């Protein structure tokens, strides 16, 4: 409107301003009728007498005017280095030492070959021609420097150049002696390389699968932070805030949920209960009177919520531990305080960390039960026997039966928390890092159940839930009475949730509530 | 600093 | 425009049997970039050792392209730059102090013995590999010693002293009206894109990270200038791209290029940097993720040149290069590994495989849906051949 | 010792110091309007309306002194580190061509303005008396007012990346490698 | 120490029948391996720390006999066609031609005339100051007899006499604006070695923030869901992106649903990296600017590449002369929204009317066509 900016730029910027609001920008376009960072330019300064072999097409078609440099699009300071685990750095160090040995041995071998051909020439030539023979620079072969480096590395660089000169000159001597010495160095470096290969292989076995464990090495510390009350409410509140923002700037009324936790597979609940029972039986913090109440509460909550026919757990767990010693019903709201929510969030965290293990277990049992050797690691014993000597390799049986058995071994402490990591590493590639914290997550789940009963008002809300679920028919008035009754047992400043459950699909949706 | 991470 | 689907196993195309001219000098590999440097020419030998120990020399021709000459490198670089490379050695770098600073040689692209030989070998293969593609003598030239796509007209940037790819495309251009340079190295083909930034006869399409990595360039809006406008494509990506996503962005993009900028030759930089486990990379790709790129480019039935550029794991690059070589020959390689001269190098299970790590894939949809949407809009201008 | 540069020339100098150092774009030399041309136009314009030989000779002496001090100082205190390679290349070109360097006939108005800005420090560095200091400052301020009347002739804003007829030319990586290396 | 015998060790008449190989000893035990010497196996320490507590199949020697020397393509050669460590002139580091006499040091391209490193005058080189010291003898009477004569011989430019005189006695000095001109613009600020910076340049990060950040920190806000703290720090609320109008963080059990968000350096408006198409957080270089700010360079084509730049911010010299408003009143682009570098003060309704009549009278002009 003052002839400093044109229509195109105005519309382009108003797009960033009046963007997602499609109607207003449509009006703007209709009324106003709207129908490279790098590569600076070198002007012409000097391109005269470069490229002594350039030709017509090559000269012109190429680009000389526009130039680009790393420092133009770096603001004089940039090019950060991608971070690497200490295991990746150990792999790099091993690789760099292997390369050192190979580069100094293979080049010595190339020079040995050239010198062997030369010496063969010398032997089949008579004394006179020996004394007159004279190799040219490069020894007649394609290279001109490799033999130079090889001799310099071996022969006292000053005397090394003295050699590289004598060799080019009279080779009736020198070439034989130089070949001998190169043979001695070759065998010595081969011995050393063979010795070093053991330690390099062992270090590689130790650190390899860890190196590829990026999201799993930070795990077990990110779980502690992000698996907490604050973070768990933060996620739900954020989804609610996004819905309320598409309420400010998009439809006002519609959302009636914010999470959609789903449970396609039963028979994982029993595994969670088994792990909880094992932990309970191991803990010294609780006393035996408390452990039984904890176990009963855990087995009872899920059977009440998902309607899992309590006896089913009774028989399934008993069968699981039997072989151990041989060696109108519809949507049903729950309502909750922060205490119930984090407990029922730990439960779904475990279930979600085991469902992936189930699917990958099908595929990965298929895989592992066909893990082929090759041919030459066995003759030379080049494979990692460590995970087999202590029987952590997943050969022989299922994957979603050895993960849980190993978890039990870990909770009881019979299994080191380090070897469990490796066992879950080179038995899943690296896809079960979320299981690295299975003792800690189950410990937290049992602690939250303990808080669930030995709190006071939380136990009362749980009792109210028990009363409501065991009902047969409920009305909107009954639901309202449920809401106010649960609220009565929480301060007006506490958060209330609306955990919902549908028996048909075994999917539960949270409905974070505003006072 | 204005180059590859290099050695 | 970006829809993600799982990654299917690589299957050779039965209707695209190709003659393959695989270039390898028994000397490239005896040169070292230093005592701690990432780039290591020994990778090329290890790729050969697998290629040879596997059965592939029966299905291909091994050529030792003669080293390039000064007047032959100068077709892209400058007289003084080449004159500098041909005379600088570790024992005389001092006398070239001004030139070393001038040409960016000494700090991260060091002066190692036989530097000139290495570039000549890399240059000769790329030039000669294009010659065979030119004189209808082969349908695929494999030079896993060039691919040095960072060297520019007069500077040795990022371990690349001589931009042999330009020499190759220059040779490919004395025959083929158009070329397409797909680069899939994690870094960006600054040297190659710069050389053909103004011309419409070469479309440099580079996939890379962009934002804080060595090249620095390659922003989505670097689409060429002058007549070469819209004939340069850049696909900036974030850390930890995986096969399912790379394949879902690489494939639709390359299809649209090949469909509208109908080329008569293809150069495919195959850099091992974009593979999980890199020493200077942040891409989470398996061999099959890398190889799916090579197969797709092959699928289009156009003469191709495959060069090996960046790779610093030297084992995850040798494997894929062998897995690529034994994939242009229409035979899917075995997952075991033959007894090579370098078998200790290979991991716990001495198998032809590079394992993706669990890194988080941050290249979310609705971003790759915008990068591809922009690229498609630009390519709409190349629609008219 | 308190020179009054108009804010417009301050903005021009601050564009210059933010180009040669941040954007690494040295000036286009030889310029379209060198120091000789600008000083000569200044003389031929102002002396045309001055009064008395005293003033008509003060102008003539001031321009001559400006030119002679520019020629001896530019190589010494008017180039950023980046421009000291352009300067060296011009010097070597002169030596080869056997034509002694004459910066007044090569460099443009921006470097003259640099000289103006640095002037007070140089005046303070001498034992030069108060009367001459007053006269110098008055003449320089008059000159700067004149340049203000003709700012959109010597310091127009043009894009080096969009026109070859721009006062600034982007450097090359191989240029600033030597210049700042 | 046996003498460094010249290996050939000719015996009778240069027949070289007998040799004498150099002693290796060195270049051996060199301990330059990235470990211990190359001829020795891994150390006992490395062993203890590191351990875990088919040649007939080699198809390699069969390579020379299937490699064909290849020579096609051009192949014709295409024949045809004590001393200071910083430069006293620019105050920076580099190679120096240190003075034998003076303690000052200069670059080779900072001297006057610039000196080529490979074409040094060699011998002994003096700086301008020491040359003047020996040319003047440091006494005042001779210096007077010299400088007054100089002034007399320069009568034509006597007005500039001493300025001309004093150049000879000064070493070369890099040009830098005196502070009395930079101060006019509070935004600008010098850099570490003269890198002349503005408000648009990001504060540099420290080595602690880059080289010490653990896995998941720094530029590493791309590797984990760990930086879920894209929640408004000051208020504890959620940083909402301006375009999608929501904050995405998913859960620790669904980190793939989180979308990166960044706050603009100039105005702290949050944006999704996927909404303003970007591939990384800046963290370096310049300060990020939303796509929601007004342009500074407004390059215009009507070629007529007429440039428009927003006048640099002036010291509180700054003037705001009040309008009488309504149409006209053509400011260049400078404005100070209100409820000789004169920042015009346009209030609110004037913009409305000015845009209204611009677009309307332009549409009527189109009608004229
Ligand atoms: Zn690379
Ligand atoms: Zn200096
Ligand atoms: Zn001195
Ligand atoms: Zn902003
Ligand atoms: Zn957004």
Swiss-Prot record, chain A:
- Top-rank taxon of the source lineage equals Eukaryota
Q: Where in the cell is it found?
A: Nucleus
Q: What's the stated role of this polypeptide?
A: Catalytic component of the RPD3 histone deacetylase complexes RPD3C(L) and RPD3C(S) responsible for the deacetylation of lysine residues on the N-terminal part of the core histones (H2A, H2B, H3 and H4). Histone deacetylation gives a tag for epigenetic repression and plays an important role in transcriptional regulation, cell cycle progression and developmental events. SIN3 also has a RPD3 independent function required for normal longevity.
Query: How the protein assembles, per its UniProt entry?
Result: Component of the RPD3C(L) complex composed of at least ASH1, CTI6, DEP1, PHO23, RPD3, RXT2, RXT3, SAP30, SDS3, SIN3, UME1 and UME6. Component of the RPD3C(S) complex composed of at least EAF3, RCO1, RPD3, SIN3, and UME1. Interacts with ESS1 and STB1.
Q: What else is known?
A: Present with 1660 molecules/cell in log phase SD medium.
UniProt protein name: Transcriptional regulatory protein SIN3
Q: What is the lineage of its organism?
A: Eukaryota, Fungi, Dikarya, Ascomycota, Saccharomycotina
Q: Which residues of the full protein are shown?
A: 693 to 1319 of 1536
UniProtKB/Swiss-Prot annotation, chain C:
> Reported effect of changing residue 331 to A?
Strongly reduces HDAC activity
Annotated stretches, region: Histone deacetylase: 18-330
Q: What class of enzyme is it?
A: hydrolase
Query: What are the BP-aspect GO terms?
Result: cellular response to heat; cellular response to nitrogen starvation; G1/S transition of mitotic cell cycle; G2/M transition of mitotic cell cycle; heterochromatin formation; meiotic cell cycle; negative regulation of rDNA heterochromatin formation; negative regulation of reciprocal meiotic recombination
EC numbers, comma separated: 3.5.1.98
Any one cellular-component term (Gene Ontology): Rpd3L-Expanded complex
Pfam families, per database record: Hist_deacetyl
| Motif ESA1-RPD3 motif per record, residues | 319-339
SUPFAM superfamilies (alphabetical): Arginase/deacetylase
The protein's annotated catalytic reaction(s) are: N(6)-acetyl-L-lysyl-[histone] + H2O = L-lysyl-[histone] + acetate
Going by the entry's taxonomy, the superkingdom of the source organism is recorded as Eukaryota
Effect of loss of the gene: Heterochromatin spreading downstream of the silent mating-type locus HMR.
Family membership, please give it: Belongs to the histone deacetylase family. HD type 1 subfamily.
**Role noted for this protein:** Catalytic component of the RPD3 histone deacetylase (HDAC) complexes RPD3C(L) and RPD3C(S) responsible for the deacetylation of lysine residues on the N-terminal part of the core histones (H2A, H2B, H3 and H4). Histone deacetylation plays an important role in transcriptional regulation, cell cycle progression, DNA damage response, osmotic stress response and developmental events. Is involved in rDNA and telomere silencing and in double strand breaks repair.
- Entry protein name: Histone deacetylase RPD3
Q: Provide the species name.
A: Saccharomyces cerevisiae (strain ATCC 204508 / S288c) (Baker's yeast)
**What lineage is on file?**
Eukaryota, Fungi, Dikarya, Ascomycota, Saccharomycotina
Swiss-Prot record, chain D:
Extract the GO molecular function terms from the UniProt entry: histone reader activity; methylated histone binding
Q: Where in the cell is it found?
A: Nucleus
Its function, per the record, reads: Component of the NuA4 histone acetyltransferase complex which is involved in transcriptional activation of selected genes principally by acetylation of nucleosomal histone H4 and H2A. The NuA4 complex is also involved in DNA repair.
Q: Name one GO cellular component term.
A: Rpd3S complex
Q: Which UniProt keywords apply?
A: Chromatin regulator, DNA damage, DNA repair, Nucleus, Phosphoprotein, Transcription, Transcription regulation
Question: Coverage of the whole protein, first to last residue?
Answer: 220 to 400 of 401
Q: What is this protein called?
A: Chromatin modification-related protein EAF3
**To which protein family does this belong?**
Belongs to the MRG family.
Q: Which GO terms of type biological process are on file?
A: DNA repair; DNA replication-dependent chromatin assembly; DNA-templated transcription; negative regulation of antisense RNA transcription; negative regulation of DNA-templated transcription; negative regulation of transcription by RNA polymerase II; nucleosome assembly; nucleosome disassembly
Q: Which domain of life is it from?
A: Eukaryota
Give the miscellaneous note.
Present with 1890 molecules/cell in log phase SD medium.
Residue ranges occupied by any MRG domain in the UniProt entry: 1-180
Source organism per UniProt: Saccharomyces cerevisiae (strain ATCC 204508 / S288c) (Baker's yeast)
Say if the entry is tagged with keyword DNA damage: yes
Assembly and partners are described as: Component of the NuA4 histone acetyltransferase complex composed of at least ACT1, ARP4, YAF9, VID21, SWC4, EAF3, EAF5, EAF6, EAF7, EPL1, ESA1, TRA1 and YNG2.
- Its predominant location is nucleus
Swiss-Prot record, chain E:
Subunit comment: Component of the RPD3C(S) complex composed of at least EAF3, RCO1, RPD3, SIN3, and UME1.
The source's superkingdom equals Eukaryota
Positions spanned in the full protein: 78 to 565 of 684
Annotated GO molecular function terms are: zinc ion binding
Protein function? Catalytic component of the RPD3C(S) histone deacetylase complex responsible for the deacetylation of lysine residues on the N-terminal part of the core histones (H2A, H2B, H3 and H4). Histone deacetylation gives a tag for epigenetic repression and plays an important role in transcriptional regulation, cell cycle progression, DNA damage response, osmotic stress response and developmental events.
Compartment(s): Nucleus
Name the keywords, alphabetized: Acetylation, Chromatin regulator, Metal-binding, Nucleus, Phosphoprotein, Repeat, Repressor, Transcription, Transcription regulation, Zinc, Zinc-finger
Task: Please state what the protein is called.
Answer: Transcriptional regulatory protein RCO1
ZnF (PHD-type) spans are: 84-133, 238-296
Q: Which first-to-last residue range defines the signal peptide?
A: none
Please tell me the species this chain comes from.
Saccharomyces cerevisiae (strain ATCC 204508 / S288c) (Baker's yeast)
Q: Name one GO cellular component term.
A: nucleus
GO BP terms: namely:
negative regulation of antisense RNA transcription; negative regulation of transcription by RNA polymerase II; nucleosome assembly; positive regulation of transcription by RNA polymerase II; regulation of DNA-templated DNA replication initiation; regulation of transcription by RNA polymerase II; transcription elongation by RNA polymerase II
Q: List the disulfide bonds.
A: none
Which additional comment does the entry carry? Answer: Present with 486 molecules/cell in log phase SD medium.
């Amino acid at each position: 409107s003052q002839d400093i900016l044109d229509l195109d730029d105005l519309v382009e910027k108003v797009d960033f301003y009046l963007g997602s609001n499609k109607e207003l920008f449509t009006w703007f376009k209709n009324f106003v009728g709207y129908q490279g960072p790098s590569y600076k330019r070198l002007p012409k300064s000097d391109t005269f007498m470069p490229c002594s072999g350039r030709d017509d097409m090559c000269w012109e078609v190429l680009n000389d005017e526009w130039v680009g440099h790393p420092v133009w699009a770096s603001e004089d300071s940039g090019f950060i280095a991608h971070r690497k685990n200490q295991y990746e750095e150990t792999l790099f160090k091993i690789e760099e030492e292997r390369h050192e040995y190979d580069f100094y041995i293979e080049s010595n071998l190339r020079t040995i070959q050239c010198l062997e051909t030369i010496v063969n020439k010398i032997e089949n030539m008579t004394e006179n021609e020996k004394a007159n023979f004279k190799l040219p620079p490069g020894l007649g072969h394609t290279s001109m420097t490799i033999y130079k480096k090889v001799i310099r590395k071996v022969y006292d660089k000053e005397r090394g150049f003295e050699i590289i000169d004598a060799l080019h000159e009279h080779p009736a001597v020198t070439a034989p002696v130089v070949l001998k010495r190169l043979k001695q160095k070759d065998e010595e470096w081969r011995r050393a390389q063979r010795e070093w290969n053991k330690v390099w292989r062992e270090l590689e076995q130790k650190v390899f699968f860890k190196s590829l464990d990026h999201l799993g090495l930070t795990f077990k510390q990110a779980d502690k932070k992000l698996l907490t009350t604050k973070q768990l409410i933060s996620e739900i509140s954020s989804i609610k805030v996004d819905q309320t923002n598409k309420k400010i700037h998009w439809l006002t009324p519609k959302p009636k949920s914010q999470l959609d936790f789903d449970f396609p597979d039963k028979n994982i609940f029993y595994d969670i209960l088994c792990l909880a029972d094992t932990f309970i039986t191991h803990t010294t913090a609780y006393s035996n009177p408390d452990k039984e109440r904890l176990k009963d509460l855990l087995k009872y909550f899920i059977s009440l919520f998902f309607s899992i026919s309590f006896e089913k757990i009774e028989e399934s767990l008993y069968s699981h531990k039997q072989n151990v010693s041989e060696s109108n019903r519809s949507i049903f709201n729950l309502f909750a305080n922060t205490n119930i929510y984090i407990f029922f969030r730990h439960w779904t965290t475990i279930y979600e960390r085991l469902l992936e293990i189930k699917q990958m277990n099908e595929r990965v049992t298929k895989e592992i039960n066909t893990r082929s050797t090759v041919t030459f690691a066995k003759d030379l014993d080049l494979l990692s026997s460590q995970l087999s000597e202590m029987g952590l390799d997943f050969v022989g049986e299922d994957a979603y039966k050895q993960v849980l058995r190993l978890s039990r071994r870990l909770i009881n402490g019979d299994l080191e928390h380090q070897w469990f990591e490796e066992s879950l590493r080179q038995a899943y590639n690296n896809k079960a890092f979320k299981l690295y914290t299975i003792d800690k997550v189950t410990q937290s789940l049992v602690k939250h159940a303990h808080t669930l009963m030995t709190d006071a008002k939380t136990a009362e809300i749980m009792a109210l839930f028990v009363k409501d679920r065991n009902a047969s028919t409920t009305s909107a008035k009954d639901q309202i009475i449920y809401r106010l009754q649960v609220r009565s047992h929480m301060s007006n400043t506490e958060n209330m949730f609306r955990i919902e459950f549908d028996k048909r699909t075994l999917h539960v949706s949270i409905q974070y509530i505003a006072l | 600093x204005x180059x590859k991470x290099x050695x | 425009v970006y829809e993600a689907t799982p990654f299917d196993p690589i299957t050779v195309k039965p209707s695209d049997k190709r003659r393959v001219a695989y270039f390898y000098d028994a000397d490239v590999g005896n040169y070292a970039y230093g005592a701690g440097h990432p780039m290591k020419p020994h990778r090329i030998r290890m790729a050969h050792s697998l290629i040879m120990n596997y059965g592939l020399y029966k299905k291909m021709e091994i050529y030792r392209a003669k080293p390039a000459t000064k007047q032959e490198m100068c077709q892209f670089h400058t007289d003084e730059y080449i004159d500098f490379l041909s005379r600088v050695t570790p024992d005389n770098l001092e006398m070239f102090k001004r030139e070393s600073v001038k040409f960016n040689v000494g700090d991260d692209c060091p002066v190692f013995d036989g530097l000139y030989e290495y570039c000549s070998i890399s240059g000769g293969g790329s030039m000669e590999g294009a010659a065979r593609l030119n004189r209808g003598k082969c349908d695929v030239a494999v030079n896993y010693a060039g691919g040095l796509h960072h060297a520019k007209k007069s500077e040795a940037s990022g371990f690349c002293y001589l931009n042999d790819i330009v020499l190759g495309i220059i040779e490919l251009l004395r025959y083929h009206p158009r070329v397409l340079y797909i680069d899939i190295d994690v870094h960006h083909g600054d040297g190659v894109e710069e050389a053909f930034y103004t011309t419409d006869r070469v479309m440099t399409c580079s996939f890379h990270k962009y934002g804080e990595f060595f090249p620095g360039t390659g922003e989505l809006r670097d689409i060429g200038v002058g007549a070469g406008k819209n004939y340069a494509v850049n696909v900036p990506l974030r850390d930890g791209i995986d096969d399912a996503t790379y394949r879902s962005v690489f494939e639709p993009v390359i299809k649209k290029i090949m469909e509208w900028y109908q080329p008569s030759a293809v150069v495919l930089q195959c850099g091992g940097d974009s593979l999980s486990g890199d020493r200077l990379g942040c891409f989470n790709l398996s061999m099959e993720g890398h190889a799916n790129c090579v197969n797709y480019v092959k699928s289009f039935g156009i003469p191709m040149m495959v060069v090996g550029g960046g790779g610093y794991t030297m084992r995850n690059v040798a494997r894929t290069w062998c897995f690529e070589t034994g994939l242009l020959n229409n035979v899917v390689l075995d997952k075991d590994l033959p007894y090579n001269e370098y078998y200790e190098y290979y991991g716990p299970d001495y198998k032809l495989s590079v394992r993706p790590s669990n890194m988080f894939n941050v290249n979310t949809p609705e971003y790759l849906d915008k990068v591809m949407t922009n690229i498609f809009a630009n390519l709409e201008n190349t629609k008219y051949a | 010792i308190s020179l009054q540069i108009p804010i417009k020339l301050k903005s021009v100098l601050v564009d210059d110091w933010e180009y040669v150092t941040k954007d690494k774009k040295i000036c286009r030399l030889p310029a379209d309007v060198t120091v000789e041309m600008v000083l000569n136009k200044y003389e031929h314009e102002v002396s045309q309306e001055l009064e008395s030989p005293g003033s008509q000779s003060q102008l003539s002496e001031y321009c001559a002194g400006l030119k002679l001090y520019f020629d001896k100082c530019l190589g010494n205190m008017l180039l950023y580190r980046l421009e000291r390679l352009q300067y060296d290349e011009l010097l070597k070109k002169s030596s080869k061509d056997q034509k002694p360097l004459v910066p007044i006939r090569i460099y443009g108005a921006i470097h003259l303005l640099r000289l103006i800005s640095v002037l007070p420090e140089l005046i303070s560095s001498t034992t030069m008396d108060l009367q001459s200091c007053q006269l110098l400052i008055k003449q320089t301020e008059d000159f700067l007012v004149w340049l203000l009347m003709h700012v959109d002739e010597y310091f127009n804003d043009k894009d080096p990346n969009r026109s070859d007829d721009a006062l600034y030319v982007n450097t090359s990586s191989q240029y600033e490698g030597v210049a700042l290396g | 120490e046996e003498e460094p015998k010249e290996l050939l060790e000719k015996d009778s008449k240069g027949n070289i029948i007998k040799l004498n190989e150099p002693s290796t000893i060195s270049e051996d035990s060199k301990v330059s391996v990235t470990g211990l010497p190359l001829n020795k196996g891994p150390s006992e320490k490395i062993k203890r720390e590191s351990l875990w507590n088919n040649r007939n199949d080699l198809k390699t020697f069969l390579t020379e006999n299937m490699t064909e020397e290849s020579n096609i393509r051009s192949t014709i050669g295409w024949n045809g066609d004590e001393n200071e460590d910083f430069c006293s002139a620019c105050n920076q580091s580099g190679s120096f031609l240190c003075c034998d006499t003076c303690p000052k040091s200069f670059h080779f391209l900072c001297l006057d005339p610039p000196i080529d490193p490979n074409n040094l005058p060699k011998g002994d080189w003096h700086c301008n100051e020491c040359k003047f010291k020996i040319f003047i003898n440091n006494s005042m009477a001779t210096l007077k007899k010299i400088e007054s004569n100089f002034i007399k011989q320069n009568n034509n430019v006597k007005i500039f006499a001493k300025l001309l005189f004093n150049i000879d006695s000064h070493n070369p000095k890099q040009f830098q604006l005196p502070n009395y001109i930079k101060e006019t613009f509070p935004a600008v600020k010098t850099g570490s070695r003269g890198q002349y910076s503005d408000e648009n340049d990001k504060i540099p990060l420290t080595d602690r923030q880059l080289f010490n950040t653990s896995y998941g920190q720094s530029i590493t806000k791309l590797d984990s869901y760990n930086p879920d703290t894209h929640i408004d720090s000051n208020s504890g609320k959620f940083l909402i992106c301006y375009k999608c109008n929501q904050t995405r963080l998913g859960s620790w059990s669904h980190p793939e649903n989180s979308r990166l968000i960044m706050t603009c350096d100039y105005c702290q408006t949050p944006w999704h990296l996927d909404c303003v198409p970007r591939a990384s957080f800046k963290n370096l270089g310049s300060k990020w600017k939303c796509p929601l700010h007004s342009p500074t360079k407004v390059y215009k084509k009507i070629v007529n590449y007429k440039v428009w730049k927003k006048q640099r911010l002036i010291n509180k010299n700054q003037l705001y002369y009040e309008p009488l408003q309504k149409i006209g009143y053509q400011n260049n682009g400078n404005i100070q929204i209100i409820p000789d570098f004169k920042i015009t003060q346009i209030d609110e309704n004037s913009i409305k009317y000015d845009f209204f009549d611009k677009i309307y009278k332009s549409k009527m002009v189109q009608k004229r066509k």
